Amino acid sequence: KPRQKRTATKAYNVTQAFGRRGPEQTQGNFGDQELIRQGTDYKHWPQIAQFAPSASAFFGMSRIGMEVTPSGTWLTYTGAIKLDDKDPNFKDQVILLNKHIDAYKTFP
Amino acid sequence: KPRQKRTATKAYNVTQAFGRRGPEQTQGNFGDQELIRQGTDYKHWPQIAQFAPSASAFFGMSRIGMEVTPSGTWLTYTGAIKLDDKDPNFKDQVILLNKHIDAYKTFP
Ligand SMILES: [Cl-]
Ligand SMILES: [Cl-]
């Protein structure tokens, strides 16, 4: 499976499918130890997935680029997804996202 | 319906769902005239969607951040998807992606 189509689960976790969390531009930085170990099996995964873009929104909202480097050809992507301040779970969504963004920095 | 979960089609095109293509930091720049008016009805949509990330890969591969500005709270994302240069279809993949990246510059 191409890396972009992989689905993390307890049997193929975030580390196995997408590598260690870290600070380099080539590494992902999202996920506490519980989400890394369980992937889509994570109890709060659906609350995180509501922010993931559809294939249409991924190519409709993102700034797409093509880069040819010594390591190969890359499809770059950047963008921002607005949370809904009126959503009654807004305060829980902020806490949940804060719990996984750069959570690796505190792993024992 | 959240912008990230929208699906562009002939009835609800890329401009109506994700705004006019353009060069600004959080403005979409992908799509020629044909893709903008057809969205997922585009006859070559599958060869574009093969590069869209699953929800799991989006949070596993990307660099996720969160910003609070006067417009609201935003989930920022950045990353790069490696193309398989060993795939016999690689040249066609490069041609297809380059046809839509910044295509808006050649038309009103
Ligand atoms: Cl699709
Ligand atoms: Cl999912």
Q: How many CB atoms lie within 10 A of CB B87?
A: 11
The continuous run of DSSP H or E covering B95 comes out as helix B90-100
CA distance A63 to B24: 9
Look up residue B70 and give its DSSP letter. T
CA distance A7 to B26: 27
CA distance A2 to A30: 20
The continuous run of DSSP H or E covering B56 comes out as helix B55-61
- Beta-bridged to residue A23, according to DSSP, are none
C-alpha A49 – ligand 2 centre gap (Å): 6
Please give the C-alpha separations between residue B99 and each of A20, A60, B28, in angstroms, as whole numbers. 34, 15, 15
Query: By C-alpha distance, which of B102, B89, B93 is closest to B24?
Result: B102
CA distance B54 to B63: 15
Nearest residue in B to A8, CA atom: B56
Helix/strand/coil percentages in chain A, nearest 5? 40, 20, 40
Residue B73, token pair as written in the block: 């709270």
Handedness of CA A30, B67, A80, A76 (dihedral sign): negative
**Which member of B28, B49, B65 has the closest CB to residue A62?**
B28
Residue with tokens 């040249």: B91
Q: How many helices (H) and strands (E) does chain A have?
A: 5, 2
Amino acid at the residue B76: T
Bridge pairing between strands A63-69 and B72-82: unpaired
C-alpha B25 – ligand 2 centre gap (Å): 27
B15 touches chain A (CB under 8 A): no
Residue B49, token pair as written in the block: 């969607």
Bridge pairing between strands B63-69 and A72-82: unpaired
CA distance A4 to B51: 7
Spatial contact of A63 and B27, defined as CB atoms under 8 Å apart: yes
Q: Which residue spans within B1-108 are E strands per DSSP? A: 63-69, 72-82
